[PDB]
Paper text:
[name]/Syndapins are [name] (extended FCH (Fes/CIP4 homology)) domain proteins implicated in endocytosis because the C-terminal SH3 domain binds physically to the large GTPase dynamin, the phosphoinositide polyphosphatase synaptojanin, or the branched-actin regulator WASp. Consequently, it has been posited that [name] operates at the intersection between endocytosis and actin assembly. Drosophila [name] consists of an N-terminal membrane-binding [name] domain (residues 1–304) linked to a C-terminal SH3 domain (residues 439–494) by an unstructured linker including an EH domain-binding Asn-Pro-Phe (NPF) motif. We have solved the structure of the Drosophila [name] [name] domain (alternatively termed F-[name] due to the gross structural similarity of the [name] and [name] domains) that, together with the recent crystal structures of the human [name] 1 and -2 F-[name] domains, reveals unique features of this membrane-binding fold.
The structure of this domain (residues 14–301) was solved by X-ray crystallography at 2.7 Å resolution by single-wavelength anomalous dispersion (SAD). This [name] domain, like others that have been recently solved (FBP17/CIP4, FCHO2 and [name]), is a dimer resembling an elongated bowl when viewed from one side and a tilde-shape from another. Each monomer is composed of three long helices, designated α2 (residues 24–71), α3 (residues 76–118 and residues 127–172) and α4 (residues 182–190, 199–207, 213–253 and 261–273) that are flanked on one end by the N-terminal residues 14–23 and on the other by C-terminal residues 274–301, including a short C-terminal helix α5 (residues 277–288). The dimer interface is formed by residues restricted to helices α2 and α4. The insert in Drosophila [name] (120HHTLMQIK) is structured into a prong that protrudes approximately 18 Å from the concave face of the domain. Yet the radius of curvature of the [name] [name] dimer (∼21 nm, assuming prong residues insert into the bilayer) is significantly smaller than CIP4 and FBP17 (both ∼30 nm) or FCHO2 (∼55 nm) making the packing angle of the [name] [name] dimer more similar to the radius of curvature of the N-[name] domains of amphiphysin and endophilin (both ∼11 nm) than to other [name] domains.
Residue numbers in the entry:
A (entry chain B): 14 to 298
B (entry chain A): 14 to 168, 189 to 303
């Protein structure tokens, strides 16, 4: 079966050590990826703000109204910083931590992950004795079913010898001898089989102890990985939680301070001063 | 000079009307562009979410730990929806109300903006009488200035009829002047009146842009997105459900020592 207790089957557990390495790679990759998305948004915002900053400048809007329009560009700048800092937090608070743990817990030798290779070895050692007894049981079982088979086809041929009266006495005798010799075989074999089953049945618990002990070494390492991953996940969470960016309220507060300063009278009066009736004229003389 | 009072120069006030209308188009383009960026963030988030959602199921992580990694995917999805609403509010709401105001306060004759032609007309009307007096002043200034020239090289029939000429020029010059000087008050009064119509209208727009900027602000103002504190608790509870004990127990049952075994048993012969 697929049972753990079956020879070689501890390999799902050892494979899981190496899966732990892979999941470090995956998590780093996933975070880096989100980081690029945040870099990308901020980068877009800034491009936008550079573009309109200039179109407003160079275009017809003026005065505090101009300054109000500009408020929006300042907003997006402050927002972009927030997002750069999340990019930077994800990469140097979070990803580096993972990068570090992964370096520290997985070593690479002989085209293997040593933590895997060592433990496969430890299981293999733990399982070797009982593998023998299992092998024995399996020979004994085969060696006894083929003795059963022989004996049934040998007692057959004797059938049709005592009904073939031309055979020589030596021929009739060989067949008689084979039957008796092959039922020595059925017996001898039943015995070795029963003894092999007994021999293994007494090792089982030693086997169980041994494998339990190796398995739990594995569970302990795994426990640790799972704990670590839980923490980094919270650390990720910290990086992304907007409700804790303390500047956010202030960005909007300040953004509407600017809109509020948009003053039509200031703007209009200025316009007259520079372009309309409140300019000097010397009349003709 | 570039003084508004010289003929022609009312025009910068006039260009301003049409610049008004132009700015509405610019404003909508600005907002449209911001909205597109928001939509970009949101689309990105979801692509990322869909990608890793798959790569995680497929990968080795299982259990509640696996459900915690999926926390991020959900938060990401929720953030995308916040920005998608920002796109929509900006577009389907702020931009259309500009579009509406644009069409309520500007109208065209043929290809030209009517409010601008009207007020260019009124300017010219008021400027015209005065411009005519100024045209007079300009002629009689030139007449006099070349009765200067045609009595400087005369210093006997061309000696006293050109002192008669500096009598009739300096006379006329000084009366064109008196005449314009008398119209000034009126011209002042009528340019004043037209310019005020230009200011009243321009004021409408300045007040309207203030309002629209406030709306843009309400649209963009993260501190007022209700759902957002809550997104991040939904997320942390998900992380907090990672239970290594159950994930480990699960493993021991499906892959490790608590699995059942058949121990070797004597099997008989066919
Ligand atoms: Na400008
Ligand atoms: Na999985
Ligand atoms: Na829990």
């Amino acid at each position: 079966s697929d049972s753990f207790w079956e020879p070689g089957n501890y390999k799902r557990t050892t494979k899981r050590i190496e899966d732990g390495y892979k999941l470090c790679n995956d998590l780093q990759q996933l975070i880096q990826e989100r980081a690029d998305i945040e870099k990308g948004y901020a980068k877009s915002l800034r491009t936008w703000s550079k573009k309109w900053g200039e179109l407003i400048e160079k275009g017809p809007e003026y005065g505090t109204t101009e300054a109000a329009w500009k408020g929006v560009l300042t907003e997006s700048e402050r927002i972009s910083d927030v997002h750069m800092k999340i990019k930077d937090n994800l990469c140097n608070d979070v990803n580096s931590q993972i990068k570090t743990w992964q370096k520290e817990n997985y070593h690479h030798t002989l085209m293997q992950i040593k933590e895997r290779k060592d433990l496969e070895d430890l299981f293999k050692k733990a399982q070797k004795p009982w593998a023998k007894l299992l092998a024995k049981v399996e020979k004994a079982k085969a060696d006894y079913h083929s003795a059963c088979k022989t004996e049934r086809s040998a007692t057959n041929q004797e059938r049709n010898a005592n009904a073939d009266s031309s055979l020589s006495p030596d021929q009739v005798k060989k067949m008689h001898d084979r039957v008796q010799k092959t039922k020595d075989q059925v017996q001898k074999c039943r015995e070795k089989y029963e003894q092999a089953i007994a021999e293994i049945t007494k090792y089982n618990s030693v086997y169980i102890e041994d494998m339990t002990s190796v398995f739990e070494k594995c569970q302990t390492f795994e426990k640790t990985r799972l704990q670590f991953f839980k923490e980094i996940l919270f650390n990720v969470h910290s990086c992304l939680d907007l409700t804790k960016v303390q500047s956010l309220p202030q960005i909007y507060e300040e953004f509407s301070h600017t809109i509020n300063n948009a003053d039509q009278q200031k703007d209009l009066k200025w316009w007259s001063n520079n372009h309309g009736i409140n300019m000097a004229m010397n009349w003709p003389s």
